[PDB]
Amino acid sequence: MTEYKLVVVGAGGVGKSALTIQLIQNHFVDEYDPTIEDSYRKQVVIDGETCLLDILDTAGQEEAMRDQYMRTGEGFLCVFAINNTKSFEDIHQYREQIKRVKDSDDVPMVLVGNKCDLAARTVESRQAQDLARSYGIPYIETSAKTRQGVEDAFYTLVREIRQH
């Protein structure tokens, strides 16, 4: 079957792991346990197609080894939190990093605004839409806590790879 290698990138504490684990195990991780390196594998059916998802959950805090997995990945989930302006601003650097490694401006990506269950919003939807538009990618809001948009974020990333 088709195997999609997805890489989840973004600043620390935005909910990269919470999203991934919610997708894999339908469980919300309430605690904050910073990631070093975590890979997950899941067999799913996306649009009538039996898919094998290989997902790499990366470290937000520093750490290099980034270039290594950025060459492997076919699709990138760029995550920020809507209650974390700085994390949203860091997205550009992640995009540039992916752009350099793959030497392309046509890398399958999806911009993800997480923690949409919170009312402490400092990043407006329109702002993120503009950022995504400049990259040529979709923008999706999610909540790993309420499962909102989670499947949609990942499945959209698969469908973006299919276009490329």
Place this chain on the structure above:
Amino acid sequence: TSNTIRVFLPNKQRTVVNVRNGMSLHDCLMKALKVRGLQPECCAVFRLLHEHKGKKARLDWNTDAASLIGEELQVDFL
């Protein structure tokens, strides 16, 4: 400061765990296995020996995890 252990999981998955004072091998791999739909009491865990390629030494789940800091482990099915 780096008190970590690289672990190769079944189905070609992998994780790096953090080790803290008093943790057993079971206590530091508990979460990583659960979220991937695996029970510890269904898997054998091994240490991959230095200076070789395939050298595999079986461990006990109640082993102090501090003893394995900086090492690479492998979890398999039974």
